[PDB]
Structure formats: C-alpha cells, structure tokens
A paper describes a structure:
Recently, two novel Leptospira-specific components of the flagellum, FcpA and FcpB, were identified whose deletion abolishes the ability of flagella to assume their characteristic supercoiled form and dramatically reduces motility and virulence. Our structures reveal that a conserved FlaB core assembly is enclosed by an asymmetric assembly of sheath proteins with novel folds and functions.
Here, we present structures of flagellar filaments from the saprophytic spirochete Leptospira biflexa, solved by a combination of cryo-tomography, sub-tomogram averaging, X-ray crystallography and molecular docking. The resulting averaged map achieved an overall (average) resolution of ~10 Å and exhibits a series of concentric protein layers centered around a ~ 2 nm central pore, as well as a distinct array of globular features decorating the filament surface. The asymmetric localization of FcpA and FcpB, specifically on the convex side of the sheath, is distinct from previously characterized exoflagella but is consistent with prior flagellum electron-microscopic imaging studies performed with antibody labels. Following 11-fold averaging, improved resolution in the core region allowed for straightforward fitting of a core atomic model representing a single 52 Å repeat of FlaB (11 subunits), which we obtained by applying estimated pseudo-helical symmetry parameters to a FlaB monomer homology model (backbone-only atoms) derived from the reported flagellin atomic structure. The resulting filament atomic model exhibits a consistent set of interactions between FcpA and the FlaB core, reflecting the approximate helical symmetry of fitted components. FcpA molecules project both arms toward the core region, positioning the long arm within contact radius of two predicted loop regions in FlaB. Modeled FcpB subunits project their central β-sheets radially away from the core and present several elements within contact radius of the FcpA inner sheath layer, including one of the long FcpB α-helices (α4) as well as several loops located at the proximal edge of the β-sheet. The modeled FcpB sites are too far away from the core to make direct contact, providing an explanation for why deletion of FcpA leads to concurrent loss of FcpB from the filament.
Numbering used by the authors:
A (entry chain BA): 61 to 219
B (entry chain BI): 1 to 32, 37 to 76, 90 to 160, 177 to 187, 192 to 221
C (entry chain BB): 220 to 272
D (entry chain BB), F (entry chain BV), I (entry chain BM): 8 to 60
E (entry chain BE): 55 to 291
G (entry chain BL): 114 to 219
H (entry chain AG): 61 to 113
J (entry chain BZ): 174 to 232
Write the structure that this text describes.
C-alpha cells in the first residue's frame, strides 16, 4: 500500500505540474508581448490591444491556480502554507510510521509583480513598471514558477 | 435542608417580582412581530380572568395585552391586565408603566409537570405587590382543579416558580419587548 | 490554443492517475495466482490423505 | 474432524477466484470490496478526465 | 457602579480564572481545594474518584511539558534540506500533526481517568452524600477539565452533554464561561448543519440553543437591560 | 517470492517508456524531471532567440 | 541532494527487521561488543557475529555552498567533495559487500 | 446453518450492491451530461434533449 | 456464476466495435447516439458549406 | 491595516483620520507627479470626505 | 568588532550582488553598523570626533 501511496502521489504531483506547464507558457507568451510593448514607438493604443491579450492571460493564471484540483484538493491557490487547516499533501511512503513526506506549493497572479496596463491614457487604473524591471519581473515570474516545477520534478524522481 | 429551601423560594419570589415589574411596562404597546408571535390589544373582560381583544387594536382605552405564541399549534398564552388608564399622548416612546392587576397565563404545549401534574393555567392576582405573593397565585391542575401556590408543600412550590411561572413571565416579557422594539 | 495544451497535460496526468489507482501489474498478480493455485491443489490432496487416517 | 485443510482449500479457492476478478478487468480494484476508497477516487478521476476532454 | 455590578465584576474575573488553561500554580491550587473536599467527606470512593481525576490532570500537565520539549528539539535540528518555502512548511506540517496527534492520545488517557473518576462518584449511592458540596465541586472539576481537554482539540460537539451536566450542578448555571462555551459549541453544530446541508429541525435546534446561552452569558456578565443585553435582545428576535 | 526479474521487467518497461518521451520531442530534456536546470536554461535561451529575432 | 541525504538518515533509522534497528550506530560496539549473534550449529560455540552501521554521518556530510542559503552549512574543496562522495560510496559498498559475503557464508 | 445464514446474507448484500453499481453508472452518466449542460452556449433546446436522457 | 469477466468481455467487445465505427468514418460522431447535438449542428453546417459554395 | 480597525469609536479618532488623510495625500501626489491624473480622482474624493479636508484649497 | 563588522559587510554585499531578501540585507547592514560603531567607541572613545561621525552617518 505504501508503494501505491507513493505512485498515487506521483500522479498528483504530475497533475500540479501540468497546471504549472500551462502557467509557464503563459509567462513566456507575456514576455514575448512585454518585449513588443517595450518598443517606445509602439503606441499606447496598440499597447491597449496587447494588454487585452496580457490581462486575460494574467486572469487565466489566477484561474489555473484557483481551480487546479486533484481528488477535490486544490493544489496551487493560496491554501498553502495554510488554509482553514494546515493539512496538506502528506504521502506515506514506507510501511511503518515516521516514513513520511509533506508537499506544499502556491501560485496565483500574486506570484510575481503582476504588471497590468502601461503609461498613457487607459480605461484601467493600472500601469506597467520599468521595462527593464518588467523584463526582470517576468524573468522572476518564470524563475519562481519554473523553480516550483523543479520542486515537483525532483519530488517525482524521489517517489 | 429547609434553609436551602427557604433561600431558593426567596430567590424565586424576587425573580417573579423583577419580571412582573418589567411586564407592567408593556403599556407602551397600547399606542403602538417576532416569528410565530401574535399580539392583540384589548380590555379585561367576562369574569375578570380573561382578556378580550379590541375591535380597535390601536384604541387608547385598551388596558390589557393578549399575546399568543405558536410553534411547530398554539403553545403559550399570556394576558397582562393593567391598573389605570393610558396617557393621552399617542406616542408610545413617552408611555409609562402601570402596575399589573393580574397576570393570566396558559400552557397548551410544552407542558411542565409538577409532581407529575400539569398546571395549565396560572392566575397571579397581585403581580406588583410583595414578591412573596404565593397566596395570590392560583394553579389549575390537569391529570383543571384549583390550588393555591401558598398551600403547595415545599420541593414543590419552588419547582412551580422555577420550572413554570418565572420562565413564562420571562418568555412573555421577552416577546412583548421584541414586539415593542420592532415598532418603536 | 494555449488552454488546450494546459488541459491536455492535466488530461494525460489524470489518466495516469486512473491507471495507477485501478490497473494492476499483471505479472505480480499472475505470481499470486500460481502460488494460490498450488496451495489449492495441496489442500485437496491432503484431504484425500486425511480421509485415510 | 476434517483437519484445517478444509479451511485452506476453501480460502485458496477464494484467493484464486479473486485473482480472476482482478486479472480479467486488469484492475487492483474491480469492486468496492477490493478498495472502496481507491474506487471512489477513480470514479472522481473519470469525471475529471471526461469533463476535461 | 451598583453594589451588584462591582460584585459581578469580581465574580466574572474569578470565573475566567476558574476556566483558565491549566498551569502549575493552578494545578497546586486545584489539588489543595479538591483535597479539602476529601478532608470533610472521608469517603473512599470519593478519594478514588479524586485519585483518578488527579492522574488525568497529570496526563494533561505531562503532555504540555512534552509539547514544549518536542518543539524545542525540532527547533534545535540543523535543517539543511530546507532551501524551499514548501520544505519549511513541510517540516512545519510534520510538527503540527505529530504534536496534535500526541495531544489526542493524551486527551484519551486523561478522559479514561476522568471517566473512572465519574464511575467512582457513581458508586456514592446515598442521596445525602450526593448532595454534599464535596461531591458536587469534584464532579464540577472533573467535567471542567474534560470540557477543556476536548475544547482545545476542537472537539466541540463532544463538549455539549458535559457542559449541560456541568451547569446543572450547584449554581454552575450562573457561570459566564460555561454559557460562552455552550453558545460556541452550539454555533459550531449550527455551522456543521449549514455546511453538510443537514435537516432544518437540527439547524433551528442548534441556532436556538446558541442564542439562549449567548443571551444568558451576556445577562450574567453585563446585567439584564444593559446596553450589551439590549443589543443581544434585538438580534435574537 | 517473485525473483528480482519482476524489478527488471517493470524498470525496463519504464526505461522504454522514458526513451519514447525523449525521442518524440528530439530531446534529452522533455521535462524538469529529466533536468530541471537544463530546462530552465533552454527556456531562457528561447526567450533570447525570439526576442533577438 | 539534501533530501536524498535526509532520506539516508531516515533509512538508517527506519530499516527494521522483526522490530530490530539494523543500521543505526549500535555497531561495532555499544556498552558491550555483543552484536548480531546468529547461532549456526546445534551445539554451543557454533556462532557468528555481524556488524554494520550507517547514518548521514557515514561520510563527510557536505551540503550547501557559498552564496544565499537557508541552511547553516557550505561545501568544501570541490575536488574533496567529489572524493567525499567516493568515500561515501566506498564505505557503504564495503558494508553491503560484508553482508553479501555473510549471506554466502550462511 | 449459521455459516449458511452468513452466505445467504452475502447474496442479499451482493444483490443490493449490483443495483447500486447500476445506480452509480447512472450518476456518472448524469454528471457527464450536467457538465455539457453547464455550457452557457449549449442551447436550451439542446439542453431539453439532454434532459430527455 | 460467471465472474464479472463476462460483463467485461461483452462490454469490451462493444467498445472495440464502437471504436471502429468512429475510426473508419474519421469521426467523433458517427451517430446521434455518440452525440445528437454535435450531429445536428454538423448537418446544418453542411447545408451552409454547400449553400455557400 | 486601517480597514482592520472595526470599532466605530476608534475609526472616528483624530488619530485614525489624519493618518488615512496623509496616506491618501502621498498616494495622490505620487500619481499626480507621473501624470496619472484619472487615477487621482477616487482618492481625492475619499480624501475630502475625511475630517474637514473638503475645506482644503489644494484638494 | 572590526572582524565582525567586516564579515557582516561581506554578507550584506553578497545579498546586494545575488539580489537576496531585504530582511537579510537589513539584518547584515544593522549588525555591520552596530560593530562598526562599537569598534569606533572602543578605540577612540565615546563622543570623540570619530564616534560622533560614525553615529551621524548611521542614523
């Protein structure tokens, strides 16, 4: 049964990862868009068109984190490091007691500096940051989530 | 022993007195509901032990409050009979208390047992007098025969006020206040 | 099109879950079968001898 | 009295039969009697797989 | 204030102290007074009931010492595989469940002793003895520690029959914490019905009992027809 | 008990499966589970390739 | 790596047989030199002794590296850190071989 | 006879269970249909067809 | 009684058959029984394709 | 954090109102300097509602 | 105190170069300043031109 628990854990961990692959491709797409946006002759009106694409991609991230469930457990939203209870992903790996592991993880749009909008006239109330930091921020976003995926990857190999 | 019994009776006499002093305040409802509660305004009538609802509920000459309590059927009734007329002023926020001449209560459902009998009717004919007014409380017993609380052995007399009468006085002061606060 | 990639990854992983939760390794269940079948035969034979007693 | 061999024989006949139940469907769990919780979870997983598709 | 309000303030503070989470000074004070009951009572079954209660409280006190020592020993480990946020939370989740589960075992051992204390009090059959302040105060202390042991582990439904037995004893009904805990435990049960989509009869039963003990706790601490009472009056309507 | 061969059989089926994961994408690294850092770096290189274009 | 090493400490602690701890440091001596005595022949003085122990402190337990850490350790000379892992493998491989050889004796 | 009663009980219980397997196959099918139904561009007329099922 | 395998065998023979119905036509939907609404819509789309041409 | 002060006797304190005003003022000015003028309106409006800020000419 | 201040300074610089957390930046900066000032006090004396200088730079 411990072997089974180990294997059921492997898939849970992979499920989480699939949502994070989704999450990273999003950052990579936003990064592509940020580079276009960082072009100072690319206009504010055209930037609003980009922000349509980016804003929804940001919302999609928050939705992935919110609804990414396995066996009705939410594996990505901020129920880590604690929700109503700290109860999280314990896997019981050996046949005896004290042969145990816990896994925790969290992402939402507030995983990185969640930049929306851009200088100029908008219909929102938000603007993007220093283009250099916006690039750095998206590297930070990618770094933070890819690093979280690395956690799951390595964890899978342990199992 | 009898010492504890004596102290218990005293606490219960004062408990029914303090609530009767609050019940005499519900005069404020004559110039004026919580769930399952129905209030009628009226006058003492018939043989003087029952309250007759007014055709004119808002009338300034009503001197009795009749309150019915329902639950899941009629469970309880109280009739507050007041001494003295109401203030001429139509605003209930200005109205003052009137010592009760009588309190008549009925239990229909959720009946309490005193030595295995139900006292379905309680008639208090001196609610704002000396707290020790057991001789003024008539008990109508079902297994309804008339007994006087002061002639009840004592535990028995204590159980009557502890289990039946104080609680009903408090329940109705609670409901009359609930109605008042909603409309005040 | 992005969303489909995300959904497809979750899909494959969820199907891996179903297989690992329900689908047995036939090799080991076959080993169990053989052990149990032998014990059935051994049982029957000794009742034949127990009858002799 | 029949020696314990009658116990073994019945039990091993049952283990062989149970092995068939599992092997034919390919699953550790064919029934709630094998594992009620593994079953309930895989039923949830199936609605997740199909809903997702 | 009035003479009764000044008296009431004093009494509420004494009642809050009475329900104070156990510690070593309270332990000593408690067993001074519970033994004072053994002094007058001179009853072997009461003595046995107290001996078992004291063993139960000792289980609780020894557990509190264990929890500090365990957390200390964990804090003093070098955590070189803790470079992730999740790994720090992981090790936290290890601590909390081991501590909570160990407290759960201590709770059962304490309640087995409290159950034995009650079973010995059950053997005092003479009604002239069962009505003794010595009998009632010990029974009250056994129930209070029992209520608290369950309360600490969030076992609130389990506290209801014991709180109800508690308030029936020697004016315990006039204790503000007893009504506060009853109201909170009833509130939990009401919320359970709302979350599990249970029957309406139980929803209203639990809501009603919550409001009764909410109102009574308010009355006892602040006085009837105080700004604080009057507030609860209108909400309960 | 099943001899060590049951280990080999499961593991080799897994090595065959892993070989397919890599081969179809053309890559040593398909997942972080093959190499989390080789992956993260190639993701950076890809943003550099596209940004550069 | 760190989790893998922590797993080693757990293996050493949790590696039980008939409730015996077979890897923690009760070997090659405790308060007495008595160890895993096996009685091989039918008579007295027909006996064998087995010793073994491992824990993370089996090798030079190097974790972490200069820069940002949440740990309290850093790695040493890279070449020696590599040599250390050979030492780790050597010490355990020999212990396994000792058991292997012992099995063949049995 | 007590052993027989135990076994006759097994048949009662298994009969009941089979009808509940049927019942769960139904729930899983209704859930599949509910997910389709929850699609806000899946029309009311088409929902009536689902409601037939 | 024949164990559940007689259920599996019949059902799997049917799933194999259904798989062929889809595969040879190239379609998720061959019949209304696969998806009555997907079918009705494609029939409308076909009149739109031909009418448009 | 100011939102977590729920007691109406505390929210009506001159201590509460002045800080909330200074937080809004710096917020308004930070946006104003970068020409983010539409964004300043809801904060200016919340500002003038507090403790006679409506009588301030710059607001 | 000179060695403590220098070693803490190194650690502060590591956080600045590796772009580490602010809590560690300030922790290391704080400890550098405590031991910088204490070394100054010990060698030159309290309220010496050198003490007064380091205090004014840190505050």
């Amino acid at each position: 049964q411990a072997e089974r628990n180990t294997e059921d854990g492997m898939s849970l961990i992979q499920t989480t990862e699939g949502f994070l692959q989704e999450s990273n491709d999003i950052i990579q797409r936003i990064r592509t868009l940020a580079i276009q946006s960082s072009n100072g002759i690319y206009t504010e009106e055209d930037r609003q068109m980009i922000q349509v694409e980016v804003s929804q991609l940001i919302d999609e991230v928050d939705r992935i984190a919110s609804q990414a469930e396995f066996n009705k457990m939410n594996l990505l939203q901020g129920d880590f490091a604690r929700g109503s209870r700290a109860t999280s992903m314990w896997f019981h790996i050996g046949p005896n007691m004290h042969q145990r592991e816990r896994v925790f993880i969290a992402t939402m749009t507030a995983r990185s500096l969640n930049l929306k909008g851009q200088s100029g006239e908008l219909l929102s109330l938000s603007t993007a940051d220093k283009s250099n930091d916006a690039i750095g921020t998206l590297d930070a976003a990618l770094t933070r989530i890819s690093k979280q995926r690395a956690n799951l990857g390595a964890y899978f190999n342990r199992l | 022993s009898g010492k504890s019994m004596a102290d218990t009776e005293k606490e219960l006499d004062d408990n029914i007195s303090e609530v009767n002093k609050r019940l005499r305040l519900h005069t404020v409802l004559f110039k004026m509901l919580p769930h399952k509660t129905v209030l009628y305004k009226g006058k003492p009538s018939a043989d003087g032990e029952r309250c007759e609802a007014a055709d004119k509920q808002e009338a300034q000459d009503n001197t009795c409050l009749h309150l019915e309590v329902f639950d899941f059927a009629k469970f309880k009734k109280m009739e507050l009979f007041f001494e003295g007329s109401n203030n001429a002023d139509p605003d209930p926020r200005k109205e003052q208390p009137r010592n009760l001449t009588k309190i008549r209560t009925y239990i229909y459902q959720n009946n309490f047992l005193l030595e295995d009998k139900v006292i379905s009717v309680i008639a208090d004919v001196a609610p704002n007098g000396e707290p020790a007014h057991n001789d003024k409380i008539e008990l109508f017993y079902q297994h309804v025969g008339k007994y006087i609380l002061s002639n009840v052995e004592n535990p028995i007399r204590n159980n009557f006020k502890k289990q039946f009468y104080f609680k009903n006085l408090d329940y109705f002061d609670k409901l009359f206040t609930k109605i008042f606060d909603y409309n005040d | 099109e992005h969303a489909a990639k995300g959904l497809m990854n979750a899909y494959e992983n969820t199907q891996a879950s179903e297989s690992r939760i329900r689908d047995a390794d036939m090799a080991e269940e076959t080993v169990a079968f053989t052990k149990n079948q032998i014990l059935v035969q051994s049982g029957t034979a000794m009742l034949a001898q127990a009858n002799v007693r | 009295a029949a020696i314990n061999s009658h116990r073994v024989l019945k039990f091993q006949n049952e283990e062989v039969s149970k092995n068939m139940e599992k092997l034919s469907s390919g699953m550790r769990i064919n029934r709630a009697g094998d594992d009620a919780s593994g079953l309930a979870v895989s039923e949830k997983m199936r609605t997740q797989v199909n809903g997702l598709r | 204030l009035t003479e009764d309000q000044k008296k009431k303030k004093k009494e509420i503070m004494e009642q809050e102290s009475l329900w104070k989470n156990p510690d070593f000074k309270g332990y000593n004070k408690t067993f001074q007074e519970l033994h004072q009951l053994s002094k007058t009572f001179a009853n072997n079954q009461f003595r046995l009931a107290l001996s078992n209660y004291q063993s139960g409280v000792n289980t609780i006190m020894k557990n509190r010492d264990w929890v500090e020592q365990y957390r200390k020993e964990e804090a003093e480990k070098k955590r070189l595989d803790e470079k992730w946020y999740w790994q720090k939370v992981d090790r936290k989740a290890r601590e909390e469940r081991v501590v909570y589960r160990e407290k759960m075992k201590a709770k059962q051992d304490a309640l087995n002793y409290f159950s034995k204390a009650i079973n010995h009090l059950d053997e005092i059959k003479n009604p002239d003895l069962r009505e003794r302040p010595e009998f009632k105060r010990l029974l009250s202390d056994v129930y209070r520690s029992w209520i608290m042991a369950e309360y600490d582990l969030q076992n609130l439904p389990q506290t209801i029959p014991i709180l109800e037995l508690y308030i029936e004893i020697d004016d315990n009904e006039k204790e503000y914490p007893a009504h506060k805990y009853l109201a909170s435990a009833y509130s939990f049960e009401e919320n359970m019905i709302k979350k599990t989509k249970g029957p309406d009869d139980m929803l209203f039963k639990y809501r009603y009992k919550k409001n009764v003990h909410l109102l009574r706790a308010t009355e006892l601490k602040y006085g009837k027809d105080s700004p604080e009472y009057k507030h609860i009056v209108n909400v309960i309507n």
